[PDB]
Design a binder for these strands. Structure first.
Lengths: 51, 526, 46, 102, 24
DNA sequence: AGACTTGTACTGGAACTCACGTGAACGAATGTTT
DNA sequence: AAACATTCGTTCACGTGAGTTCCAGTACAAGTCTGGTC
């Protein structure tokens, strides 16, 4: 269990009550793919640069 | 597909008359037309738009050779809209002192449409007319205009300053109070109502809108919206029963169809900026590797399992696409709306041509509705698309009937979270006064009203008919930046906030109960 | 040795007689470029 | 007035926290009880994160339910359902209505 | 608590997926 | 003196989620060529 | 009149970046245990 966000319901500019948002239903996705060095079989760091 | 839209604008002196405490009708009409043009331009729509203004001091149109149809100008012929029209309307359009009728303007618009449509094939022809109906008009040509409209089968819409204390544009309230309307306005309303009802029957009464209402209804583009592409399939209960069906995306989240391109500040071209990705190993040398020297893998609980793309494709779950198979029928009470998944809702009708599928689908819909049951179906768009399990339920209307399909969750898509009950909590147990206060607040903030005790409810705040404000804000900011490169973005328009806010009546009714609850309910930050 | 050099070899299924790490060490003894996953420039897969 | 077929986004669950504002649990419970007994769902503008367009959503109260073993299956709170905007809808083609024999 | 999974404590033991079981 | 344990705080990384962008399968409709 | 392509238009799957919650690791202060000599 983990709240998506702790938001603050605002009935008025004065009345304010904190609440938490959860997802009782969530789409199931396969684990993200990981890039690997073809030779050593170790994780490789990916860096993006702009020039 | 493409269409012609002729916008008729009144620039008479009466329009310039700004009643104190209420925005002038000219400003409202300008805002509505500006919003329409912004949507038509920034959306990259292959539509042709022309502007005709009546009441101008000058005269420029094909039918102005003689003394007939004076004070009518064609600011732009039929063509793809551009920033030029927005610049012209925003800055160099002003009210005209001379007063002109509107039937002559309608005839001029018809002539313009007929002349311009010769060289191109247009699926739909549209006319939008914004007038306050405060100018004398000639009724001699009523039959001619009616016959021309009937023969040319061109849609027509009217916008008025008044719909059929404080005033807010698009504030879900009365824009123009029914106290001050003159006899000429009543005659104009009567004649336009006659024209609309004759053209489109009783349904035409809803084709006359108000500027404030139109600003928060997305009605200007009602007749120039393209139909969704149909998805053909076969609903198969078993191996011997099959009904040809067509599915459409009834509800789908709308996003921006254009992305933001990054360009250099010195030179505003995307070619200069180049992005490259370099892969390095976890070592001091930081040795670089090529794309061909990279493989795909997955984690297996502290263990790394390589999985090549070709390997994944070979071992990928293979199935046949474009399938609509009924896995069974279950009581409607067994399917809960809270479990609905996916980002779309499908509306399934029978095939376009054949009638056997139509009768079969109608029979299935009626049986499901009268038995209070829904069909659990397997949905697969294409071969690549992953199959899903969804619920299809009947949807019967006086004019049409279909099946509404919404995706359902899988066993692993559900989250098992345990919470603490509130009813059986001593610390969290509101007293009688708290319940009474909450009851008063709920009753004072009702968003629905009884429709004259006619077993019907009228919605005070129908959010489902409110357009998305993000698109309008983005269009406004883009137009401001284009026309004023050396100025910052402007603030959000007041009418947007008014349409995104509830009617002032609810707040006025809820003022007192809200303060009472605040006083009664302790609230301390921690 | 000198002959068994400048060659890319990949092994992914060893026999009970010699485990995969043992065969990897052996082939490395003669100077064989060990590659865990074969690529476009691999002599063969063992 | 909450049409079932007006589904846009998967619904969320709103539950009192009391970690930030004290005394919110009692107000939340009172609101839930009154809404359940009145069959009325709250309407609220929702903005999850900063610099995000608002969305009109409806909070429908949820009544705690337990199975035969007294195990929670429908936790109490509010169900947040996203209400689609005008442009979120689509226009369907006109189709003549055909009836079916009994 | 009854029905608690022996593999993952604190989570309800999900029942096996049956599918479609036509009634009598 | 010193070193280890306890607490307190404080921060940065990991996992989760959503929004944006892109690539590419593919499915069908239509236009053109034989 | 039939077949192919093309096109094209769409839509779904996959990948990358920003915000939120949770927990591991680190710095500093204090308590606690222990050493020796006059």
């Amino acid at each position: 269990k983990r709240a998506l966000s702790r938001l603050k319901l605002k009935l008025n500019k004065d009345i304010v009550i904190s609440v938490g948002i959860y997802n009782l239903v969530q789409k199931a996705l396969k684990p993200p793919p990981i890039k690997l060095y073809r030779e050593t079989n170790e994780p490789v760091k990916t860096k993006t640069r702009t020039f | 597909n493409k269409a012609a839209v002729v916008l008729c604008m009144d620039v008479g002196f009466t329009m310039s008359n700004s009643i104190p405490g209420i925005e002038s009708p000219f400003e409202q009409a300008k805002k509505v037309i500006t919003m329409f043009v912004q949507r038509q331009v920034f959306a990259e729509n292959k539509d042709e738009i022309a502007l005709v203004l009546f009441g101008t001091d000058g005269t420029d149109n094909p039918l102005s050779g003689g003394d007939q149809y004076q004070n009518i100008t064609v600011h732009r012929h039929l063509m793809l809209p551009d920033f030029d029209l927005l610049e012209d309307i925003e800055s160099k359009i002003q009210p005209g002192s001379q007063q002109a009728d509107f039937l002559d303007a309608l005839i001029v618009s018809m002539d313009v449409i007929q002349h311009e449509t010769i060289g191109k094939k247009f699926e739909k022809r549209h006319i939008e007319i914004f007038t306050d109906l405060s100018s004398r008009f000639s009724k001699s040509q009523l039959d001619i205009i009616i016959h021309s409209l009937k023969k040319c089968d061109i849609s027509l819409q009217f916008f008025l300053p008044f719909s059929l204390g404080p005033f807010r544009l698009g504030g879900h309230g009365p824009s123009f109070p029914l106290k001050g309307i003159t006899e000429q306005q009543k005659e104009g309303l009567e004649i336009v109502k006659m024209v609309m009802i004759s053209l489109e029957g009783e349904d035409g009464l809803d084709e006359i809108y108000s500027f404030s209402e139109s600003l928060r209804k997305l009605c200007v583009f009602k007749k120039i919206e393209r139909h969704s592409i149909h998805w053909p399939c076969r609903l198969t209960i078993g191996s011997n029963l099959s009904i040809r069906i067509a599915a459409y995306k009834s509800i789908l989240q709308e996003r921006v169809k254009k992305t933001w391109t990054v360009v250099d500040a010195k030179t505003l071209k995307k070619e200069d900026i180049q992005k490259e990705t370099v892969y390095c190993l976890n070592d001091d040398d930081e040795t670089e590797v090529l794309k061909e020297d990279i493989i795909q893998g997955f984690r297996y609980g502290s263990d790394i399992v390589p999985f090549s793309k070709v390997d994944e494709e070979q071992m990928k779950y293979k199935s046949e696409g474009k399938c609509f198979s009924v896995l069974g029928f279950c009581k409607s009470s067994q399917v809960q709306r809270r479990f609905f998944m996916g980002n779309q809702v499908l509306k399934v009708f029978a095939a376009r041509d054949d009638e056997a599928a139509a009768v079969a689908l109608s029979s299935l819909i009626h049986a499901l509705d009268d038995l209070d049951m829904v069909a659990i179906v397997r949905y697969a768009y294409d071969k690549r698309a992953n199959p899903q399990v969804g619920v299809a339920f009947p949807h019967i209307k006086h004019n049409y009937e279909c099946l509404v399909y919404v995706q359902l969750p899988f066993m692993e898509d559900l989250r098992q979270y345990m919470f603490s009950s509130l009813k059986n909590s001593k610390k969290y147990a509101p007293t009688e006064a708290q319940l009474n206060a909450v009851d008063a607040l709920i009753d004072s903030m009702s968003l629905a009203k009884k429709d004259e005790k006619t077993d019907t409810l009228e919605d005070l705040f129908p959010t489902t008919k409110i357009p998305n404000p993000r698109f309008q804000r983005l269009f406004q900011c883009l137009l401001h930046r284009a026309l004023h490169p050396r100025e910052p973005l402007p603030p959000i328009q007041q009418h947007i906030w008014n349409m995104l806010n509830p009617p002032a009546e609810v707040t006025t009714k809820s003022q007192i109960p809200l303060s009472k609850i605040k006083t009664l309910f302790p609230l301390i930050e921690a | 040795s000198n002959i068994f050099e400048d060659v890319e070899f990949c092994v992914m299924s060893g026999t009970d007689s010699q485990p995969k790490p043992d065969l990897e060490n052996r082939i490395a003894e003669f100077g064989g470029y060990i590659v865990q996953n074969p690529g476009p420039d691999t002599y063969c897969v063992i | 007035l909450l049409k079932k077929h007006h589904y846009l986004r998967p619904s969320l669950f709103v539950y009192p926290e009391e970690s930030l504002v004290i005394g919110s649990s009692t107000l939340f419970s009172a609101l839930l009880i009154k809404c359940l007994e009145k069959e009325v769902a709250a309407l609220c503008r929702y903005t999850p994160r900063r610099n995000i367009p608002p969305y009109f959503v409806a909070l429908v109260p949820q009544e705690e339910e337990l199975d035969d073993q007294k195990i929670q299956v429908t936790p109490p709170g509010f169900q947040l359902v996203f209400l689609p905007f005008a442009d979120d809808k689509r226009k369907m083609p006109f189709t003549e209505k055909i009836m079916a024999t009994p | 608590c009854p029905g608690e999974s022996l593999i993952n404590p604190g989570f309800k033991s999900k029942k096996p997926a049956g599918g479609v079981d036509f009634d009598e």
